[PDB]
Amino acid sequence: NQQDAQINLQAVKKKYKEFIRTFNEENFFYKYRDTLKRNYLNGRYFLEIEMEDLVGFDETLADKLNKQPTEHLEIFEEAAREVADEITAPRPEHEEHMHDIQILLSSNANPTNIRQLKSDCVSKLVKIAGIIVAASGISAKATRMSIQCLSCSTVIPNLYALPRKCNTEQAGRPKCPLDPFFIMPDKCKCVDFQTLKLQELPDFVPQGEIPRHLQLFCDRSLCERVVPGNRVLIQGIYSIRKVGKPSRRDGREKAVVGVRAPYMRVVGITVDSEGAGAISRYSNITSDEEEHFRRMAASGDIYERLSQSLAPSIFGSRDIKKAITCMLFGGSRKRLPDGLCRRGDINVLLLGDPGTAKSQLLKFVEKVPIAVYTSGKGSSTASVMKDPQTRNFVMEGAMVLADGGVVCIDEFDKMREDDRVAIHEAMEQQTISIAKAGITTTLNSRCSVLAAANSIFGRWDDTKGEENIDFMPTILSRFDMIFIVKDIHDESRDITLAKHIINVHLSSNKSAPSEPAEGEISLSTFKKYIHYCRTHCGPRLSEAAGEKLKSRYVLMRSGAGQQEKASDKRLSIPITVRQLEAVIRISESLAKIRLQPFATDEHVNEALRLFQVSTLDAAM
Amino acid sequence: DIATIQKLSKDPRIVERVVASMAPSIYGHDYIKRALALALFGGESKNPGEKHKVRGDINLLICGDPGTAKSQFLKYTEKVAPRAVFTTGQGASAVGLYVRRNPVSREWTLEAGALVLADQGVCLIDEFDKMNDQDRTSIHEAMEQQSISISKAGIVTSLQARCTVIAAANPIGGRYDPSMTFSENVNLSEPILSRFDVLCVVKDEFDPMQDQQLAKFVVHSHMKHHEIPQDLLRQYIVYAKENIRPKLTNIDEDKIAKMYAQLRQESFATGSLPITVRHIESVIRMSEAHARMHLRENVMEADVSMAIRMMLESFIEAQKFSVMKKMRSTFQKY
DNA sequence: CGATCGAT
DNA sequence: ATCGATCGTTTTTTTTTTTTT
Numbered sequence: 001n002q003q004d005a006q007i008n009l010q011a012v013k014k015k016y017k018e019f020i021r022t023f024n025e026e027n028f029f030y031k032y033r034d035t036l037k038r039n040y041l042n043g044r045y046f047l048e049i050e051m052e053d054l055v056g057f058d059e060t061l062a063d064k065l066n067k068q069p070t071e072h073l074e075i076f077e078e079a080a081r082e083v084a085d086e087i088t089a090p091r092p093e094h095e096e097h098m099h100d101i102q103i104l105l106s107s108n109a110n111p112t113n114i115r116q117l118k119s120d121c122v123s124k125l126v127k128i129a130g131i132i133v134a135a136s137g138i139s140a141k142a143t144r145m146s147i148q149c150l151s152c153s154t155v156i157p158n159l160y161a162l163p164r165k166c167n168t169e170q171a172g173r174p175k176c177p178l179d180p181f182f183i184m185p186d187k188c189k190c191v192d193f194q195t196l197k198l199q200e201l202p203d204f205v206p207q208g209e210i211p212r213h214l215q216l217f218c219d220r221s222l223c224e225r226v227v228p229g230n231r232v233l234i235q236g237i238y239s240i241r242k243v244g245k246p247s248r249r250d251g252r253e254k255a256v257v258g259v260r261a262p263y264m265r266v267v268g269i270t271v272d273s274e275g276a277g278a279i280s281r282y283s284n285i286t287s288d289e290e291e292h293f294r295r296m297a298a299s300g301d302i303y304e305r306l307s308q309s310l311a312p313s314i315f316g317s318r319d320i321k322k323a324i325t326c327m328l329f330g331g332s333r334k335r336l337p338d339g340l341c342r343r344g345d346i347n348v349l350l351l352g353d354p355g356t357a358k359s360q361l362l363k364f365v366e367k368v369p370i371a372v373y374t375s376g377k378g379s380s381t382a383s384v385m386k387d388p389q390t391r392n393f394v395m396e397g398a399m400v401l402a403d404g405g406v407v408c409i410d411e412f413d414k415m416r417e418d419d420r421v422a423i424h425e426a427m428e429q430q431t432i433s434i435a436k437a438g439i440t441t442t443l444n445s446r447c448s449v450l451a452a453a454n455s456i457f458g459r460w461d462d463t464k465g466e467e468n469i470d471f472m473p474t475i476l477s478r479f480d481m482i483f484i485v486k487d488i489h490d491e492s493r494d495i496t497l498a499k500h501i502i503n504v505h506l507s508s509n510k511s512a513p514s515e516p517a518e519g520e521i522s523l524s525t526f527k528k529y530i531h532y533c534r535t536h537c538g539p540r541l542s543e544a545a546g547e548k549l550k551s552r553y554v555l556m557r558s559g560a561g562q563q564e565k566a567s568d569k570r571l572s573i574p575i576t577v578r579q580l581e582a583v584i585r586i587s588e589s590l591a592k593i594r595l596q597p598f599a600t601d602e603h604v605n606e607a608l609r610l611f612q613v614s615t616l617d618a619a620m
Numbered sequence: 621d622i623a624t625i626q627k628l629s630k631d632p633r634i635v636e637r638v639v640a641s642m643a644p645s646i647y648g649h650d651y652i653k654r655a656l657a658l659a660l661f662g663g664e665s666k667n668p669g670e671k672h673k674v675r676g677d678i679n680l681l682i683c684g685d686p687g688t689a690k691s692q693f694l695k696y697t698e699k700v701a702p703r704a705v706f707t708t709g710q711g712a713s714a715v716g717l718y719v720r721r722n723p724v725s726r727e728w729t730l731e732a733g734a735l736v737l738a739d740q741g742v743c744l745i746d747e748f749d750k751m752n753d754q755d756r757t758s759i760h761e762a763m764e765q766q767s768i769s770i771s772k773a774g775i776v777t778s779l780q781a782r783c784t785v786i787a788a789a790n791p792i793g794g795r796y797d798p799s800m801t802f803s804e805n806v807n808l809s810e811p812i813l814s815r816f817d818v819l820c821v822v823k824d825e826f827d828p829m830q831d832q833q834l835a836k837f838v839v840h841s842h843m844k845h846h847e848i849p850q851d852l853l854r855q856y857i858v859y860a861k862e863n864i865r866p867k868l869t870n871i872d873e874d875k876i877a878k879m880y881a882q883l884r885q886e887s888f889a890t891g892s893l894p895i896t897v898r899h900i901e902s903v904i905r906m907s908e909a910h911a912r913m914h915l916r917e918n919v920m921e922a923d924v925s926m927a928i929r930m931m932l933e934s935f936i937e938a939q940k941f942s943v944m945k946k947m948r949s950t951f952q953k954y
Numbered sequence: 955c956g957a958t959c960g961a962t
Numbered sequence: 963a964t965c966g967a968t969c970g971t972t973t974t975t976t977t978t979t980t981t982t983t
């Protein structure tokens with residue numbers, strides 16, 4: 001303790017200790033004491049902090065905080081427990097024992113990029129923004145422990161040398177040298193450890209290259225914090241694990257001089273707000289939000305407004321779009337005490353002439369909570385690898401990443417059939433099976449899928465009869481609403497398409513006069529709205545809906561069979577149990593939107609007219 | 621000697637002086653000269669709000685003759701233009717040399733194509749048209765969505781393909797057909813027909829005067845033993861597609877609709893081979909291309925009307941002996 | 955099984 | 963210088979999944 005500067009004491013002595021007692025505004029909210037105590041009450045053991053309060057307090061710490069944060073951010077912990085344990089006393093009688101805590105940091109300074117995380121930027125606090133891939137399980141770590149040889153809780157600065165002398169020396173002259181250390185984990189501790197991960201951005205030198213990435217670290221409360229495939233804002237720190245320059249040159253033919261490895265640990269991850277950047281699992285949403293939600297649900301002019309949410313630069317296809325979003329909400333996983341988990345999620349088909357904006361539309365359906373896109377030639381056999389550490393046979397197993405999300409693809413036609421069958425199947429039972437190596441783990445996950453396609457011979461097949469698909473009718477089976485795409489001519493239509501997109505395509509046009517349309521706004525809102533509305537309501541039918549829908553499917557199959565007989569040959573699609581079993585999910589999607597649980601058949605006449613497109617499509 | 625640009629670069633005659641430095645090889649063929657000349661440096665991202673990224677792309681195509689000099693046209697492009705790779709027809713199965721990432725096999729080497737390997741540039745094709753259909757499938761998104769997306773490994777990551785495309789193919793039917801229709805000239809499937817661009821063709825018939833003129837030019841070309849140089853315009857186009865970032869403004873953008881209607885009304889089931897809403901926007905690409913050839917950043921009727929001139933010529937090119945449809949339709953336009 | 959290291 | 967008592971010392975594997983032409 002060399003009390004001149006950089007001292008162990010001055011900070012903790014009063015400064016950090018009193019910063020919070022001193023942190024004041026009237027309204028008598030403006031401390032971190034209340035938040036701390038009320039956090040403690042519910043087992044949290046943390047609190048949230050800024051980094052530009054020091055400017056609110058002083059002008060010295062921060063330019064010293066950046067320099068040796070590893071120490072300051074534990075002096076913070078000690079000050080925290082001593083300033084909070086006084087309040088742990090209601091009187092001296094109900095600190096049954098103290099406890100350890102974790103601090104947070106945050107700011108709005110600016111995000112950096114991985115291409116610059118360099119030797120200067122090391123041991124130093126920072127901010128970035130990347131994206132997540134996958135990260136480990138939850139192993140272990142602790143802080144100290146005792147040993148029978150000395151019986152002292154072994155205290156450490158770093159988060160190993162174990163010296164010579166015995167300490168069971170009280171044996172006479174017959175002592176026990178040469179490191180006799182019996183670790184006593186009756187006396188040890190336990191914190192968490194998870195190894196988060198990080199990929200770089202999609203616009204920041206991937207151009208003539210590929211994107212690199214980084215692996216991470218945590219201690220106590222940031223496990224169970226991040227599920228992968230997410231956009232983060234971060235404050236962490238860039239540091240190493242090993243050390244050395246001189247001619248103790250590494251390995252066998254490694255390390256010309258001194259190369260040690262990278263990583264970062266987190267001091268105060270947060271998340272993103274790309275509209276709703278991070279709204280996927282947790283709830284920091286507030287009562288105003290939910291009022292907004294239900295009062296828009298109360299609004300009986302929400303669905304047709306939502307027919308105009310994906311096409312603010314696109315014209316037409318409105319009867320086409322009355323259920324392009326109903327796909328998103330999902331209906332009901334109405335499972336039963338026997339096996340019959342009748343199919344939850346929902347699936348759609350579309351195929352027709354190019355030049356009609358299928359690609360951009362599916363890009364947008366990815367845009368608007370969780371989803372992915374490849375298409376053909378290749379998300380997901382599922383993956384049984386063999387761990388290069390220890391050589392065990394683990395399962396990465398990537399429809400797992402639609403375990404509640406959805407999927408979109410075109411290019412079902414343009415990829416061969418060695419890889420269609422596991423996915424032919426998954427989307428009738430949702431259980432990814434496995435039987436390959438010594439494991440029988442019938443995995444599962446609730447994904448949907450969107451299916452675009454391309455018919456060879458175009459509208460020729462569509463004019464006359466049966467050249468609809470090139471591959472099979474068993475995946476003509478699994479889908480409910482199935483859509484031709486033509487580009488039939490009309491000069492009015494032509495000119496209107498003409499100016500419609502040019503007025504789009506001119507000067508990055510519609511910034512000001514775009515959103516002035518009615519209520520067709522904020523796909524961000526839709527992320528949140530969806531992740532809400534699916535997460536509560538579990539509706540199912542009303543009695544009056546069932547008989548008319550039943551009779552309607554009856555007449556559907558009778559008309560298909562009559563067209564079979566009105567041509568003296570099969571002129572139908574197979575009248576399946578799946579068709580009713582899916583239109584039920586269309587009713588369910590509708591009731592999911594308006595939040596009314598019990599749905600009536602007028603609510604679903606809309607469904608009738610929408611799958612009527614498929615009926616009258618495969619009518620010929 | 622750096623204002624080499626702006627001692628000259630602003631003259632009106634410089635619409636055509638760029639043609640004199642394409643490939644100093646051919647007597648005729650102003651058309652493809654000008655088309656490659658514009659499309660070597662044309663381009664605009666114009667990313668609107670969150671929708672997509674429109675194009676730094678085009679697919680000019682010349683489906684000519686098996687042996688008219690076409691494969692030589694391509695090389696000077698590379699010997700001037702900033703990026704490339706050489707590839708000829710019969711590439712891979714379009715997969716490429718799908719890895720799982722281990723420290724087994726010492727990292728299981730990794731790539732996915734060459735539009736992954738050369739974006740915002742070029743990488744070359746020759747003699748395509750007699751290649752595996754399993755590649756004509758595969759390349760058929762990167763041209764326009766300018767986006768890759770893979771699976772089928774230990775990973776499903778994705779990566780950027782912003783490029784354009786070489787063409788260089790070969791016709792079928794022997795050499796080249798009469799004015800009888802084009803879909804009959806070479807037989808590619810329906811969902812590839814979607815995109816299309818700069819439609820030129822080396823149709824041949826014999827003029828002895830021209831044979832004399834060019835052959836003098838040839839032997840003169842074979843007689844060199846031992847306006848623009850290549851010394852400069854290289855840097856002009858670095859500058860032009862790098863720094864200046866043009867625009868458009870309402871001047872006459874309604875006329876485009878009448879001409880699109882002229883397609884749909886004069887052309888329904890005769891010639892009009894699904895030429896949807898990509899080539900139209902390629903209209904804009906020509907106009908923006910012209911103004912960057914001028915470093916203009918905006919324009920009047922000039923550039924767009926030049927686009928209409930060239931397209932009017934071509935779509936008369938690829939008809940029947942009844943060859944003058946838009947010709948008769950556009951003496952009033954012309 | 956080898957080198958360090960202390961004194962005689 | 964010499965001897966002796968001190969210090970510190972460790973290595974073993976073969977085969978299965980998805981991929982590309």
Ligand SMILES: Nc1ncnc2c1ncn2[C@@H]1O[C@H](COP(=O)(O)OP(=O)(O)OP(=O)(O)O)[C@@H](O)[C@H]1O
Nearest residue numbers: 313314315354355356357358359360501765814897
């Ligand atoms: N009706 C339309 N209105 C506005 N823009 C359109 C329209 N049709 C097409 N476009 C534009 O044209 C481009 C179409 O490319 P896209 O990738 O959708 O082709 P596609 O329709 O998917 O054909 P294919 O299915 O064969 O790939 C898009 O960038 C889209 O913005």
Ligand SMILES: Nc1ncnc2c1ncn2[C@@H]1O[C@H](COP(=O)(O)OP(=O)(O)OP(=O)(O)O)[C@@H](O)[C@H]1O
Nearest residue numbers: 645646647685686687688689690691692747789790
């Ligand atoms: N104007 C010209 N100047 C120089 N050479 C010419 C000209 N016109 C034709 N040629 C010659 O014609 C030949 C054409 O063969 P080239 O090497 O171009 O293969 P290609 O024509 O691309 O044939 P393919 O693409 O069918 O294989 C070239 O050697 C080229 O020199």
